[PDB]
């Protein structure tokens, strides 16, 4: 019944700062060293650093010196990460864990901090336009932050539908595309429209998709 | 530096199948090695601990062995709930993290039906252009993209994203994104998606002219 329990996900500017808290629960407090290990999307796993909660002691990873400092309150049973001079290289989904000498063995839910010189931004939606089974699509580009669903026929069309995970790109935008593979014998008669929804930009795109004249 | 190694980096298995991992160490660690399994969107999960020592609560089919060098992590006998990536790590002196095994559902090969998209003519009025190669529904996961505009390789211009094993048909499907200025787009003819994988004898290409 050990719960360690990270605050909400953050989005940051490069040069900005960003700190993190892990509020332990459900044990002594002062019984275990904490530590802190960082993933960056769709990759592995980081270790950071660790710090000793009885008298705050701390040591990190060499490519964190003069950027992170670990700080802990034993009145809350909290330890907190803060990471300064942010860069993209930052972006990543951040634990804190607990020491039981020989492993981790709780972790916390992860905080999610993206770093990226773009502000709130709604998508442009392109047509991926159907050149037996045919496919197409929608191109959800340049949006941020995340995230954004998308939807075909209002909800009426979800067989075949695949929406890939996001990617940031070096803009710092993120973009994605949905497609769906239909039978090429629909595409003069039945419509296709992708619904995206961005709720941080209030945007809502409804994007008909249909075969491309010449 | 202490590096740790993981082999294989992708492992199709069955429920009922015996499941066996390895995790290789630089220099010798001697026994301060743990395994983690996790899941999309989770955190990790302690399995074992000294390299061998089971923690509690962890169902006994899985088990660890080794030490110096060497450790294996074994699944008697897998379920569904197993299927997931597996690191390893060392419990000493920078705390560093193998780069994960994943351990998905088997199905039979499956080659990607690929589809190549033009950018639209609205994206163009704006500038960029974005051209997009689909992979459809394949199995393993092991795929290569590779781009050619006018019979040249494309590097640093290009992003893929996969999706999460299909649970219905056992597939995956991979979307690759092209990214050119309008200027660059329009100054080349031929653009070619070609896609390697084992159910393709060889290189797959879909192209259209611009």
């Known amino acids: 019944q050990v719960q360690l329990v990270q605050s909400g996900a953050e989005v940051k500017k490069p040069g900005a700062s960003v700190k993190v808290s892990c509020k332990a629960s459900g044990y002594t407090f002062t019984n275990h060293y904490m530590h802190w290990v960082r993933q960056a999307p769709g990759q592995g796993l980081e270790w950071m650093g660790i710090?000793?909660?009885?008298?705050?002691?701390?040591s990190n990873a060499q490519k964190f010196q003069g950027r992170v400092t670990m700080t802990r309150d034993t009145s809350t049973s909290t330890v907190y990460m803060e990471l300064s001079s942010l860069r993209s290289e930052d972006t990543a989904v951040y634990y804190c864990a607990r020491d039981i000498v020989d492993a981790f063995d709780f972790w916390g839910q992860g905080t999610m901090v993206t770093v990226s010189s773009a502000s709130t931004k709604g998508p442009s939606v392109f047509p991926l336009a159907p050149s037996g089974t045919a496919a197409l699509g929608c191109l959800v580009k340049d949006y941020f932050p995340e995230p954004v669903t998308v939807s075909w026929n209002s909800g009426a069309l979800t067989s075949g539908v695949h929406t890939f995970p996001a990617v940031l790109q070096s803009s710092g935008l993120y973009s994605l595309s949905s497609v769906v593979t239909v039978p090429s014998s629909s595409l003069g008669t039945q419509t296709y429209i992708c619904n995206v929804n961005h709720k941080p930009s209030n945007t809502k795109v409804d994007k008909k998709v249909e075969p491309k004249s010449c | 530096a202490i590096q740790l190694t993981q082999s294989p980096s992708s492992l199709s298995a069955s429920v009922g199948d015996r499941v066996t991992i390895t995790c290789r160490a630089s220099?010798?660690?001697?026994?301060?090695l743990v395994w983690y399994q996790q899941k999309p969107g989770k955190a990790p999960k302690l399995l074992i601990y000294d390299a061998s020592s089971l923690e509690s609560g962890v169902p006994s089919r899985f088990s660890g062995s080794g030490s110096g060098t060497d450790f294996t992590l074994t699944i008697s006998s897998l379920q569904p709930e197993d299927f997931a990536t597996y690191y390893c790590?060392?419990?000493?002196?920078?705390?560093?993290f193998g780069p994960g095994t994943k351990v998905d559902i088997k199905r039979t090969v499956a080659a990607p039906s690929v589809f190549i998209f033009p950018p639209s003519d609205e994206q163009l009025k704006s500038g960029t252009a974005s051209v997009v190669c689909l992979l459809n529904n394949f199995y393993p996961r092991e795929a290569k993209v590779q781009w050619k505009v006018d019979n040249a390789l494309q590097s640093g211009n290009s992003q893929e994203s996969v999706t999460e094993q299909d649970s219905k048909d056992s597939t995956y499907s991979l979307s690759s994104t092209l990214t050119l200025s309008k200027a660059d787009y329009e100054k080349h003819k031929v653009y070619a998606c070609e896609v390697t994988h084992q159910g393709l004898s060889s290189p797959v290409t879909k192209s259209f002219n611009r």
């Open positions: 790590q060392q419990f000493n002196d920078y705390f560093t």
């Open positions: 220099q010798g660690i001697s026994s301060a």
């Open positions: 710090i000793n909660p009885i008298s705050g002691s701390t």
